[PDB]
Structures are given as C-alpha cells and as structure tokens.
C-alpha cells in the first residue's frame, strides 16, 4: 500500500519493541505484532525492517547498557554485566521469535545472519569490545583470578557465568572468547608460574617440590574444568608444563641435596614413582 501505512506500522512496532526492551511485554499483544510483521514482510520491505531493527537495538544498547556498565564499573561490575546480559537475552527471546518469523524468508533470500546472531554481534561490538569496557573487564578478571590463585577464596560461579556468556557471544565457536579472555590470562599465568618456579627452586629441594607442583597442577586443572569453559585445558596445561617442568628438569635432578642420584642411592621408591609419573 502507501508509504504512510507501512511507516505507521513500523512506528508502532518500534514502540512495542522499545517496551519489550524495557520489560513491558506483559502489556503487549503477540497477535498485533505478528500480523504487522506479516503485512510488513509480505510487501517486500524486509530491508527497511531489518535496518530499523538494527538501529533500534544498537541505540537502546548504547543508551542503557553502555551507560549502566560505565556507571557501575567498581560496584558489582561483573554482576551488573551478567544482569544486563540476562536482560538482553530474555528480551531477544521474543524479539528473535517475531523477527525469526521474519528471518525465515529474509535470511533464506538475502543470505544474512539471523536476528539472534545480529543481536549477539551488536552486543559484542557495543558492550564487550568497547574501548573502555574491554580493558576494564580484562583487568578485573585478571586481578580476581590472581587473588584466587594467591590462596584466598572468591566467587567462582560468577566466573563460570562470564565464561559461558563470552562463549555464547562467540556465536560461531571459540574465536572471540579464546582471544578476549584466554590470550591475556595466558600471559599472566605464564609470569605467575615462572615466578613461582623461580621461588620454589631456591627455597626447597627435589623432595617436596614435586608434591607441591603436582598439587598445583591438580588445583589448576580443577579450577579450569569447574570455574572455566568445557575444553579450556590444552594450552593452559601445555604452557604450565613448559614453564614448570621444562625449567626444573635441568637443575633439580643433578645439582645437589637429594636430587635424582641421591634419591635413587638411598632407595626411595615413592620418589622415583612420582618423578616418573610427573615427567
């Protein structure tokens, strides 16, 4: 029909979506919006609808969550981030339902990502990969994981929630999450384990150091399998071995004071067994 009719339809649909984004879907009518999406995509105006959806979503994000995260960067930063992620997801549920009715025809014809993937991408671009939020999140996660490694206990379910959030934000696999979280955490763990091995090689001998490094590996793999994502272990354990064992192998078995020769001369069976099972 005329442009005024479709403009009014799009205006009312945008108003209804804005309400859904403000958690006011209880007073919205599923029929009215589905029929309007039907009569909108029917007239071959899906491009305008998609562009308007993207614009409304990114505007709502930049106005609400970009301000909320930057306003509470020190008072429950990760908690507010997880809450905003959950709100975005629970709104994009219905948003994706309607615009998935739209997505069938649109993405099967125009060959583009779905609206759920569109929301995930725009969220990744406007919140997580922000110029300031990204570095702040990196620094705070490194600080809290270092404080956890120091010996004192902190919250652990929140880290699992954040890692699952980043994994879902990847939206294709382990491309972004393995880079935004692991890459930095890897350098920090490298420096930490290097300093730890350098401190252990001088303060102890080849007798009690092996049990300590075994306990360290056990607690590290347990934290990585319980507090982090599902695979999470190949590069972590590779770098941990390359830092600890590849450095202690040359000096701890030959120097002096009950290394490998002395612990074999006196006849220590458990020492040889644990050294064989570790190396």
């Amino acid at each position: 029909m005329d442009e005024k009719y479709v403009n009014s339809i799009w205006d009312l649909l945008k108003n209804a979506i804005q309400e859904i984004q403000r958690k006011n879907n209880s007073g919205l009518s599923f029929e009215e919006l589905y029929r309007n999406a039907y009569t909108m995509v029917l007239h071959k105006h899906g491009e305008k609808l998609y562009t308007g959806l993207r614009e409304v979503v990114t505007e709502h994000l930049i106005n609400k969550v970009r301000e909320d995260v930057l306003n509470s960067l020190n008072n429950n930063f990760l908690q507010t981030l997880n809450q905003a992620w959950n709100d975005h997801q629970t709104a994009m549920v219905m948003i994706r339902d309607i615009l998935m009715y739209m997505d069938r025809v649109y993405v099967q014809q125009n060959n583009v990502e779905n609206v759920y993937n569109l929301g995930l991408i725009i969220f990744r671009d406007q919140v997580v990969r922000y110029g300031c939020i990204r570095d702040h999140l990196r620094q705070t996660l490194l600080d809290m994981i270092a404080r956890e490694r120091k010996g004192e206990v902190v919250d652990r379910g929140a880290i699992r929630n954040a890692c699952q959030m980043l994994m879902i934000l990847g939206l294709e696999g382990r491309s972004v999450y393995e880079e935004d979280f692991e890459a930095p955490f890897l350098e920090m763990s490298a420096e930490f384990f290097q300093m730890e091995s350098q401190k252990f090689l001088a303060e102890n001998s080849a007798s009690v150091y092996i049990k300590k490094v075994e306990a360290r590996i056990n607690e590290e793999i347990e934290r990585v399998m319980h507090c982090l994502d599902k695979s999470t272990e190949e590069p972590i354990v590779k770098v941990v071995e390359r830092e600890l064992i590849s450095k202690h192998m040359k000096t701890i078995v030959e120097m002096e004071n009950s290394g490998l020769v002395h612990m074999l001369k006196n006849g220590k069976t458990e020492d040889l067994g644990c050294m064989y099972k570790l190396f």
Binding site: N25, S26, G27, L28, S29, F30, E31, E32, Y34, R35, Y38, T39, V93, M94, D97, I98, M100, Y101
Partner: peptide, 24 residues
Amino acid sequence: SSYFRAMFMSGLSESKQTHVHLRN
C-alpha cells in the same frame, strides 16, 4: 505452528487472553 508457540509462550496479554481475535 511456529507462530502459535510464541503466541502462547511469550508472557503477554494475548498469551493470557483465552478469546484471541486473530484477523487477516
């Protein structure tokens, strides 16, 4: 239908309404 699932799942006024007036 893939539309009635959202018509009955999304917490909305239409989901609660037993007398839904579907047109067109």
